[PDB]
């Protein structure tokens, strides 16, 4: 129990006619958001979205706000530069995304590094696993690949990833031990939903679990009902917790022939529940 990752997600977007570009930044440690910046607010500053982070002085907040305030300035250029690079007018709304961060083992040491960009939902550039080379997605990203090779950016980044990213991740993990390094199992149950005179919907619930990683499945007489199960995207409840249901369409009376199988890192052993009338 110690595979943890700090993750920053940036989102810059132009608004021609109606507005300056917007910068929105969020920060995660695992599935738990802890920060938020928005350049579109009353004197933008980065703000806590977790409890263990409000313990940090205005030193953090000031440093972290300015970082974003400069990253904002940076992403306003990135929008105007990508205009040149893509031979595009000051007319369309275009979009930068960025994900940087670091996975870390249970020993607390660097395990993986991340940095990657995307113009309009297409991958644009991505620092590789070695934290020393790049991966441009088109000839326009190659302009940037050689800018940055000629600038030793892959060094500046590895430093942050191997140094500051990993050190602060361990800070965060420690300051919020119970909140971050804790996996709460789901509250599971089966409901019955007669869709006919004839057949019915058995739905299997998983409520209030953390983290988001879960594996619900339906099994009729001990076999994979994979093609015949309705699965919804794991969703947030609005309270650090998540949900997810699996649902299958069965006959009537044949209901105990089905079983729901829950796997979650909060559970000692996997679950197996059927419908209890």
């Amino acid at each position: 129990m110690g595979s943890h990752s700090m993750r920053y997600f940036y989102t810059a977007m132009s608004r021609p006619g109606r507005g300056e570009p917007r910068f929105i930044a969020v920060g995660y440690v695992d599935d738990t958001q802890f920060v938020r910046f928005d350049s579109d607010a009353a004197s933008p500053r980065t703000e806590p979205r977790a409890p263990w982070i409000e313990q940090e002085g205005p030193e953090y907040w000031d440093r972290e706000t300015q970082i974003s305030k400069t990253n904002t300035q940076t992403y306003r250029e990135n929008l105007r530069i990508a205009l040149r690079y893509y031979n595009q007018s000051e007319a369309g709304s275009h979009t930068w995304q960025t994900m940087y961060g670091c996975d870390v083992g249970p020993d607390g040491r660097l395990l993986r590094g991340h940095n990657q960009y995307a113009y309009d939902g297409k991958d644009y550039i991505a620092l590789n696993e070695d934290l020393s080379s790049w991966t441009a997605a088109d000839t326009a990203a190659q302009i940037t690949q050689r800018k940055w090779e000629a600038a030793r950016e892959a060094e500046q980044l590895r430093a942050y990833l191997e140094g500051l990213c990993v050190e602060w991740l361990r800070r965060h993990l420690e300051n919020g031990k119970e909140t971050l390094q804790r996996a709460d199992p789901p509250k599971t149950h089966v409901t019955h939903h007669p869709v006919s005179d004839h057949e019915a919907t058995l739905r299997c619930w998983a409520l209030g679990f953390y983290p988001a990683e879960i594996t619900l499945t339906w099994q009729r007489d001990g076999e994979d009902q994979t093609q015949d199960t309705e699965l919804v995207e794991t969703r947030p409840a609005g309270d650090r917790t998540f949900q997810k249901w699996a649902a299958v369409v069965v006959p009537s009376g044949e209901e105990q022939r089905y079983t729901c199988h829950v796997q979650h890192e909060g559970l000692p052993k996997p679950l197996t529940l059927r419908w209890e009338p």
Partner: peptide, 8 residues
Amino acid sequence: TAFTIPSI
């Protein structure tokens, strides 16, 4: 923590 990041 955030990061200051390059141009393009």
